[PDB]
């Protein structure tokens, strides 16, 4: 009965990886547990239409 | 099988009803030789305890042992744990201090109790706090041990929740406190619910302090564990009238049904192990005339009865020495200064007869307070949006507020239930901003008869 | 006007030393008319008649403090438990002297037990001081014994809370097994070389054999254990140059007993200056009522401050363990235990002896094999 | 981030019917008129444009 | 001015009912009006409260 991590973060916490090199979304929840470098990309959110 | 049930008590329960508790019971006897010995005891001194142990184990090698206690002495269970480490006999602690929660059982023992752990009780207390949306709280912990796992369990429970608890940092104690720096931590508490972890002797000074500190207010809630709230007789005058306690002493279950269920668990594990291997009962001869490394058993019931089902009751045990589905009791202290039972505990959920939480606003008798307001409203779409509660959380989303509505069934009946629902909207935001600014409390519910209002012959 | 002091002890010479220290207890306290009766009880083959003889003899003696002073226990589980259980039934403080099991550390399990020796979590704090000396931040934790290992890991996290570092690897498992060698090779794949081990003698011997067959004690590797891993066949399977610890006046008994009797006598003469002083009842023949000033005299034991003794400043912590003891840091210089460090209460003082390492040079290994 | 939004719980309880594993699934779903909106980072959808 | 309700003492304080008025203080800056011998007791009590 526990909240645990999955995906690239869950496999990084298990030590299966060494450094996430990916378009990783920076937010409060990830920064509580792992560390971030200074970002390379800056963008917001948008809606895709047809 | 060969089981000796002894009861060291002062509440006089005689011996012939124990013979009536075994005679017609267990009509389907799967072991070929089931023999019990029912014995009573007046004192609780360990000399006579080990004397009865050595008389019963030398009494034709009795393989079962069940013990209950009247008083609140937990060291009796520690002596029984040592005897279980020595004699390798399954020992059951029923009531009193015989089943009170000790810290850490041993893998080298075969001892069990009938109760709820401090972590299960913490889960039930946080379920109580979650069902009332009292999310703004604190945590007072003294230096009585078992506190580190307690604080860690609170942290792992809050951090694994969909609630988003307003969790104030942990207020701790150091010694018998100077009341110079601990009060500075107590003045950090601007919350309502104050979570206390201490002992019963500490709690008298703690509640006398908080009454002298004025922390026993009408909005100041207090929820305490089971070890600090002892037997129903001894109630000191320093308790707030409205104190919330949780203990598993169910008044709908006496000692005889509990030891009947324990004998059912013993016979069930014995009958389930009797089909795997045949010669299951293997005890030691006696206490006297011993050498080093006696005949230790290889097939034990200690690592066998993890799951059990007795007459529908799920009395299955854990891998640590506790139960899976215990019977938690949630009591409050009424204006009659008696422990009023309110909440019974289901397999998973909390049944609440008084789920609509009342005031009991005279927590102390010298408290003139008028900060609760009975506020009613009518459901309209742009102002009063009323929704069902989230079943994934059993909790309204915190932009909304709790409410209740009197809902009947049909025109045949007239009695209904006050179903709790969620409220958001325009005037709901108005009410929240008024409660932020004026700093009052309110009692939100819905109207029953119908629409806004109209006078029909001086009847609004 | 009487004070009774019990002790479970074997040798008649240490019983005479105990009675001599009882005679020297009222040596400096003036013409105070207190009486002092001593009680000394011997061994039994099991622990059941041990508990019986000790419980009825110390109830019939009505003692205040109970001394546990047994190194040569034939039961290798080291359980003087039922004496402490019986005195915790009436909340009576038992002073142990020898064993360092963490089952006595929890005061919920042992309600009225203190001892004059600290657990191995303090040796983990000493290992944190060794990290402070050698500028190390990454450790690999290997724990066999789960009865003490969770408390040792909790004290290790208490150490790492200030530095805000974390252990690179933690392992707790079932004692008695032999293949942890896959996990040892996974620890080989990590970056740091600092290896921390806590086990009995046989498990330490098994993992030393596993580390030697996989030559895990070679160049750059760090190995650092305590006292329960440097004796028996673990000492036979130990690599040369391994670093261990040793208790100054831990294995010694007589001066330790004298310091214990001095502590107990000064605590009793401190306690006699207050009101509502109670006595142990006749708990064997029908007295289930607990002793009244149990937590009060326990707080007196908590507030016990000293500045004298053979070991020196004896002092007790929040758990009732020995504050600020004397430690020795031993080196296995070619199957010979050679002392290469001393340790007072907070500072590691290396002497003139050289630290030969199991790998290459005698210099300190910067064992950070970065990826 | 939308779960922390206390007033946008409707979107959080509605997107569970349409949560997709990869973004190419979302592109093909909005291409085949199964979707009508898609909250996403900007430059990825700019390159897809 | 965000002034809280004025703390009023009664006598040489019992530190039971006056302490409620003392624990009303959740602000920073405190203004005290008393005599010289009273202020020693007041500030010693305030040090005992923190
Ligand atoms: C407890 O005391 C009474 C009287 O001393 C004695 O008969 C017996 O030992 C106990 N009571 C029972 C079990 O009859
Ligand atoms: C109950 O116990 C058995 C013992 O073999 C175990 O294998 C099984 O998983 C359990 N089954 C149930 C009913 O959960
Ligand atoms: C409680 O729920 C469990 C499944 O979650 C079910 O097996 C059981 O029947 C329920 N309660 C009882 C003890 O009847
Ligand atoms: C009671 O009311 C409900 C809701 O109007 C309705 O569904 C139900 O059929 C009624 N029951 C009867 C038939 O009395
Ligand atoms: C019950 O009866 C009253 C009067 O006949 C009627 O107005 C009402 O609609 C009935 N209840 C419902 C909600 O069906
Ligand atoms: C201590 O008192 C007991 C009381 O019976 C007595 O038997 C004993 O002689 C005294 N001390 C010793 C061990 O000589
Ligand atoms: C495990 O132990 C066995 C002996 O019990 C040995 O044959 C084997 O090499 C060991 N290694 C593995 C596979 O873990
Ligand atoms: C021993 O060490 C040498 C040199 O590092 C290496 O070649 C060899 O594989 C090692 N043996 C084992 C079994 O680790
Ligand atoms: C223990 O210490 C005492 C006092 O220093 C000493 O007389 C005795 O010889 C020591 N025991 C040993 C190391 O044999
Ligand atoms: C100590 O003795 C006296 C007897 O009146 C009294 O001060 C007090 O009741 C006793 N101690 C306590 C705090 O109970
Ligand atoms: C052992 O520690 C004590 C602590 O007071 C100290 O007095 C003593 O000098 C130490 N032993 C040594 C370094 O000889
Ligand atoms: C040994 O103890 C003394 C106590 O003052 C102090 O010098 C220090 O803690 C230790 N040694 C040194 C010189 O660091």
All residues of chain A having their beta carbon less than 8 Å from the beta carbon of residue B159 are 3
SS3 B342: strand
All residues of chain B having their beta carbon less than 8 Å from the beta carbon of residue A2 are 156, 160
Q: Compute the distance from residue C339 Cα to the ligand 11 centre, in Å.
A: 16
| Cβ < 6 A, ligand 12 pocket | C 344-347
The answer to whether D32 is annotated as binding is no
Binding site membership of C62 for ligand 6 (Cβ less than 6 Å) = no
The DSSP result for C94-134, as a single string, is: EEE-S---TTTT-TTTSTTEEESS--THHHHHHHHHHHHHH
Nearest CA owner, ligand 1 atom 7? B42
- Kindly state whether C300 is in contact with chain B, defined as any CB-CB distance less than 8 angstroms: no
Binding site membership of B410 for ligand 4 (Cβ less than 6 Å) = yes
For E16-49, letters b (16+ CB in 10 Å) and e give eebbebbbeeeeeeeeeeeeeeeeeebeeeeeeb
CB B176 to CB C107 under 8 A?
A: no
The answer to whether A25 is annotated as binding is yes
Query: What's the Rg (C-alpha) of chain A?
Result: 14
* Residue of C61, C62, C63, C64 to test ligand 6 pocket, by largest number of atoms within 8 Å of CB: C61
* Residue of B347, B348, B349, B350 to test ligand 3 pocket, by largest number of atoms within 8 Å of CB: B347
Which residue of B82, B143, B174 to mutate against C (max C Cβ within 10 Å)?
A: B82
Q: Compute the distance from residue B217 Cα to the ligand 1 centre, in Å.
A: 49
Placement of tokens 């089931």 in the chain: B34
| DSSP assignment letter at B113 | E
Helix (H) or strand (E) run with residue B340 in it: strand B339-345
User: Could you give the angle at the alpha carbon of B202 between the alpha carbons of B201 and B207, nearest 5°?
Assistant: 110
Contacts of B391 (CB under 8 A, 6+ apart): none
In order of A42, B456, C301, D2, D43, the CA distances from A45 in angstroms are: 11, 58, 65, 12, 9
Q: Compute the distance from residue B411 Cα to the ligand 4 centre, in Å.
A: 9
For B217-233, letters b (16+ CB in 10 Å) and e give bbebbbbbbbbbbeeee
Resolution (Å) of this entry: 6.2
Contacts of B214 (CB under 8 A, 6+ apart): E19, E20, E23
In order of B298, C148, C227, the CA distances from C152 in angstroms are: 31, 6, 15
For B54-88, letters b (16+ CB in 10 Å) and e give bbbbeeeebbbbbbbbbbebbbbbbbbbbbbbbbb
Q: How many CB atoms lie within 10 A of CB C130?
A: 18
The answer to whether A23 is annotated as binding is yes
Q: How far apart are CA C196 and CA C193, in angstroms?
A: 10
How many CA within 13 A on the CB side of residue B102?
A: 28
The experimental method, as deposited, was cryo-EM
Q: Compute the distance from residue C272 Cα to the ligand 6 centre, in Å.
A: 22
CB C290 to CB B143 under 8 A?
A: no
| Nearest ligand, CA C177 | 7
Contacts of B24 (CB under 8 A, 6+ apart): none
Placement of tokens 């100077």 in the chain: B178
Which residue of D3, D4, D9 to mutate against B (max B Cβ within 10 Å)?
A: D9
User: Could you give the angle at the alpha carbon of C267 between the alpha carbons of C265 and C271, nearest 5°?
Assistant: 115
DSSP strand E in C229-362: where? 243-247, 327-332, 337-343, 348-350
In order of C157, C248, C312, C345, the CA distances from C348 in angstroms are: 21, 14, 17, 9
User: Could you give the angle at the alpha carbon of B400 between the alpha carbons of B394 and B402, nearest 5°?
Assistant: 60
Cα dihedral angle (B428, B429, B432, B433), rounded to 10 degrees? Answer: -140
Where are the alpha helices (H) located in chain E, listed in sequence order?
Answer: 18-22, 36-49
| DSSP assignment letter at C364 | P
- Kindly state whether A27 is in contact with chain D, defined as any CB-CB distance less than 8 angstroms: yes
All residues of chain B having their beta carbon less than 8 Å from the beta carbon of residue E49 are 180, 183-184
């Amino acid at each position: 009965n526990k909240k645990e991590w999955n995906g690239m973060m869950g496999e990084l916490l298990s030590g299966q990886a060494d450094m996430i090199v990916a378009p990783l979304t920076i937010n409060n929840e990830r920064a509580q547990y792992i560390e971030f470098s200074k970002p390379f990309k800056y963008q917001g959110l948008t809606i895709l239409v047809k | 099988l060969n089981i000796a049930v002894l009861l060291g008590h002062s509440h006089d329960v005689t011996e012939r009803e124990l013979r009536n508790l075994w005679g017609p019971e267990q009509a389907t006897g799967l072991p070929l030789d089931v023999n019990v010995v029912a014995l009573l005891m007046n004192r609780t001194d360990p000399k006579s305890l080990i004397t009865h142990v050595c008389d019963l184990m030398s009494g034709a090698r009795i393989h079962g042992l069940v013990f209950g206690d009247d008083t609140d002495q937990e060291a009796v269970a520690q002596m029984l744990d040592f005897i279980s480490s020595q004699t390798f006999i399954p020992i059951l602690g029923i009531a009193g201090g015989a089943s009170m929660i000790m810290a850490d059982k041993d893998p080298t023992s075969t001892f069990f109790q009938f109760g709820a752990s401090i972590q299960q009780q913490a889960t039930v207390m946080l379920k109580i706090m979650q069902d009332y949306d009292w999310h703004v709280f604190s945590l007072v912990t003294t230096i009585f041990p078992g506190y580190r796992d307690f604080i860690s369990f609170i942290k792992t429970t809050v951090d694994n929740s969909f609630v988003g608890w307003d969790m104030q940092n942990v207020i701790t104690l150091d010694t018998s406190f100077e009341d110079a720096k601990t009060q500075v931590q107590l003045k950090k508490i601007h919350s309502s619910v104050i979570l206390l972890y201490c002992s019963k002797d500490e709690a008298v000074l703690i509640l006398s302090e908080a009454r002298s500190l004025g922390l026993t207010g009408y909005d100041f809630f207090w929820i305490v564990p089971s070890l600090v709230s002892g037997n129903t007789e001894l109630i000191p005058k320093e308790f707030p009238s409205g104190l919330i306690s949780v203990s598993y002493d169910d008044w709908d279950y006496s000692l005889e049904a509990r030891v009947r269920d324990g004998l059912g668990i013993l016979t069930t594990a014995a009958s389930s192990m009797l089909e795997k291997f045949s010669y299951i009962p293997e005890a030691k001869a006696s206490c006297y005339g011993q050498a080093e490394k006696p005949e230790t058993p290889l097939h034990t019931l200690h690592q066998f009865m993890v799951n059990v089902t007795w007459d529908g009751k799920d009395l299955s045990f854990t891998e640590e020495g506790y139960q899976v589905h215990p019977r938690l009791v949630v009591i409050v202290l009424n204006k009659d200064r008696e422990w009023e039972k309110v909440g019974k505990w289901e397999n998973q959920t909390l049944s609440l007869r008084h789920a609509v939480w009342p005031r009991y606003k005279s927590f102390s008798d010298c408290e003139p307070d008028d900060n609760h307001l009975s506020i009613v409203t009518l459901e309209e779409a742009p102002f009063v949006i009323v929704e069902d509660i989230d079943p994934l959380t059993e909790t309204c989303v915190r932009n909304t507020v709790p409410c209740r509505k009197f809902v009947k069934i049909n025109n045949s009946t007239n009695e209904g239930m006050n179903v709790k629902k969620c409220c958001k909207g325009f005037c709901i935001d108005i009410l929240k901003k008024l409660s932020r600014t004026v700093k009052f409390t309110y009692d939100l519910y819905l109207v029953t008869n119908g629409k806004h209002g109209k006078k029909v012959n001086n009847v609004w | 006007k009487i004070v009774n002091i019990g002790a479970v002890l074997s040798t008649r010479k240490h019983e005479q030393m105990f009675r001599e220290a009882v005679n020297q207890a009222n040596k400096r306290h003036g013409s105070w008319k207190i009486q002092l009766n001593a009680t000394s009880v011997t061994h039994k083959p099991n622990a059941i008649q041990m508990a019986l003889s000790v419980c009825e003899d110390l109830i019939s003696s009505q003692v205040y403090a109970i001394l546990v002073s047994h190194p040569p226990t034939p039961n290798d589980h080291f359980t003087p438990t039922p004496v402490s259980y019986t005195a915790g039934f009436y909340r009576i403080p038992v002073l142990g002297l020898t064993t360092r099991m963490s089952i006595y550390s929890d005061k919920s399990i042992h309600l009225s037990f203190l001892r004059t020796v600290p657990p191995y979590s303090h040796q983990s704090s000493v290992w944190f001081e060794m990290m402070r000396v050698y500028n190390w931040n990454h450790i690999i934790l290997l724990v066999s014994d789960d009865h003490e290992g969770r408390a040792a890991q909790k004290r290790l996290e208490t150490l790492l809370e200030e530095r805000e570092s974390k252990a690179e690897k933690v392992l707790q498992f079932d004692p008695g097994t032999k293949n942890v060698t896959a996990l040892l090779m996974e620890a080989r794949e990590l970056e740091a070389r600092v290896i921390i081990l806590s086990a009995s003698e046989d498990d330490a011997a098994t993992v030393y054999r596993a580390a030697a067959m996989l030559n895990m004690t070679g160049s750059g590797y760090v190995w650092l254990v305590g006292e329960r891993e440097i004796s028996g066949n673990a000492l036979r399977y130990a690599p040369d140059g391994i670093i261990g610890l040793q208790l100054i006046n831990g294995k010694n008994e007589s001066a330790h007993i004298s310091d214990a009797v001095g502590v107990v006598a000064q605590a009793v003469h401190e306690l006699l200056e207050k009101e509502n002083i109670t006595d142990p009842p006749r708990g064997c023949v029908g007295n289930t009522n607990i002793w009244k000033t149990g937590p009060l005299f326990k707080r007196v034991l908590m507030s016990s401050k000293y500045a004298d003794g053979v070991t020196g400043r004896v002092e007790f912590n929040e758990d009732g363990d020995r504050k600020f003891a004397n430690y020795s840091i031993m080196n296995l210089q070619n199957r010979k235990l050679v002392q290469v460090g001393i340790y007072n209460g907070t500072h590691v003082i290396p002497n003139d002896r050289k630290i030969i390492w199991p790998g290459g040079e005698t210099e300190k290994p910067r064992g950070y094999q970065m990826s | 981030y939308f779960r922390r939004q206390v007033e946008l719980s409707t979107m959080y309880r509605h997107m569970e019917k349409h949560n997709y594993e990869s973004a190419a699934e979302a592109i093909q779903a909005v291409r085949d008129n199964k979707l009508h909106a898609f909250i996403w980072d900007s430059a990825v959808l700019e390159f897809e444009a």
